[PDB]
């Protein structure tokens, strides 16, 4: 499942990209496993959950770069994905 394989992959190199643009290590970890443009919504959601959860004008900048993360890793961005959960 998407939530089963999201634990195996170490997304920490991808979380390191915050403020770097505001390397290939993130895409190297992103390929595994069975991420044929699937479960990328869970992976992208996990990055938002780990760093700067919820909505500061800098998480918004981080949101734009996260959406472009699949493009630089030779992947298509998720079609159905909700990065922000207000919870109220």
């Amino acid at each position: 499942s998407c939530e089963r394989q999201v634990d195996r992959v170490n997304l920490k190199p991808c979380e390191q990209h915050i403020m770097q643009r505001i390397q290939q290590r993130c895409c190297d970890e992103l390929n595994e496993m069975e991420n044929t443009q699937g479960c990328m919504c869970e992976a992208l959601q996990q990055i938002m959950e780990n760093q700067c959860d919820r909505l500061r004008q800098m998480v918004q900048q981080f949101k734009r770069e996260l959406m472009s993360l699949p493009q630089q890793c030779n992947f298509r961005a998720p079609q159905r994905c909700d990065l922000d959960v207000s919870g109220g």
Partner: antibody
Amino acid sequence: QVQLVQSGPDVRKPGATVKVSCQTSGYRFTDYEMNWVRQAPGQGLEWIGLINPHSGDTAYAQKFQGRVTMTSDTSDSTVYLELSGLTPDDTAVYYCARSQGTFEVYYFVSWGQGSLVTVSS
Amino acid sequence: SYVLTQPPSMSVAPGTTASIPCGANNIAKKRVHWYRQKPGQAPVVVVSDDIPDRFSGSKSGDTATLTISRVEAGDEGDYYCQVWDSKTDHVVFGGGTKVTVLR
């Protein structure tokens, strides 16, 4: 030129199963998810379900769960809708819509011609 | 069970501005798209959430309104508002709004 071509009108007996096809061309298949929308002869649009040709994942509406099955064939770039247990209320024109969007944005840009399936004995 | 409520019908004088409401709970947080369906034809999207046209969308507060500037004879038809719910992974369509141009 994104083209969506559907099957012709079908007449099925009540309680039977109907299969509606949606041929796609002009765009890269398995790159955009596709949805099925049905419209009663005098009523409004009703969303049935969702299919992702790249992954095979199917997202159905709560009402249609257990009665609808969606299949995709990347060899001919087609999306199929299969409704089981046909009731007289199911007679409607069935549309297939191509979805263009990323993350929160999700909308249909290339609707199909529609298939008027009539459930009657 | 995300419900989108739309007026059943609307009559607009020619040359004036039209406003079709679409009311759901906190619809501003969601993305609202409007489709226009001529009778006997597949619906056609008039406004979407990412050249100017007479059709535009505001999406402020609990209700989202579609505005048609300078209503003409060709603007008649049924207009539908649709959003993608996240809490249930469902695509929901609003009720049919039959727009009639006064003559």
